[PDB]
Design an enzyme around this catalytic site. Structure first.
Site, mmCIF file in Angstrom:
data_model
loop_
_atom_site.group_PDB
_atom_site.id
_atom_site.type_symbol
_atom_site.label_atom_id
_atom_site.label_comp_id
_atom_site.label_asym_id
_atom_site.label_seq_id
_atom_site.Cartn_x
_atom_site.Cartn_y
_atom_site.Cartn_z
ATOM 1 N N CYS A 29 0.810 -1.210 0.000
ATOM 2 C CA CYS A 29 0.000 0.000 0.000
ATOM 3 C C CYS A 29 0.849 1.268 0.000
ATOM 4 O O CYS A 29 1.453 1.614 1.012
ATOM 5 C CB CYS A 29 -0.920 -0.010 1.220
ATOM 6 S SG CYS A 29 -2.097 1.342 1.276
ATOM 7 N N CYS A 32 0.496 3.780 2.750
ATOM 8 C CA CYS A 32 1.108 3.348 4.003
ATOM 9 C C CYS A 32 2.561 3.795 4.080
ATOM 10 O O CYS A 32 3.029 4.230 5.131
ATOM 11 C CB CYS A 32 1.023 1.827 4.144
ATOM 12 S SG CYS A 32 -0.633 1.228 4.505
#
Length: 105
Positions: A29, A32
């Site tokens: 991700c 993230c």
């Protein structure tokens, strides 16, 4: 600095610290990766008053399911072991600061 938590020590960690910020994340991700260094600065700024923990959803699916965290990144603040604030998505450090200081003496 940010420690790692797993489905096994999740509960134990929350019960030992008065204020814990848990980052539900995944290596696949991009968002993230963006907040990672931000959470690090948060860890330093509030050292001694806040524990920053990271929960890798790919390695701890039952913990993510437990809180029904379907979109990452998702950060949940726990006070005395109970959830009190949630921040969904990559956000500027000031947003985290505001929710953290909201629960600090």
């Amino acid at each position: 600095k940010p420690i790692e938590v797993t489905d096994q020590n999740f509960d134990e960690t929350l019960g030992q610290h008065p204020l814990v910020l848990v980052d539900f994340w995944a290596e696949w991700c991009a968002p993230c990766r963006m907040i990672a260094p931000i959470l690090e600065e948060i860890a330093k700024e509030y050292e001694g008053k806040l524990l920053v923990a990271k929960l890798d959803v790919d390695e701890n699916p039952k913990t993510a399911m437990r809180y029904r965290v379907m979109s990452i990144p998702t950060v949940i603040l726990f006070k005395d072991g109970q959830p009190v604030e949630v921040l969904v998505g990559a956000q500027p450090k000031r947003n985290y600061q505001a929710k953290i200081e909201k629960h600090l003496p």
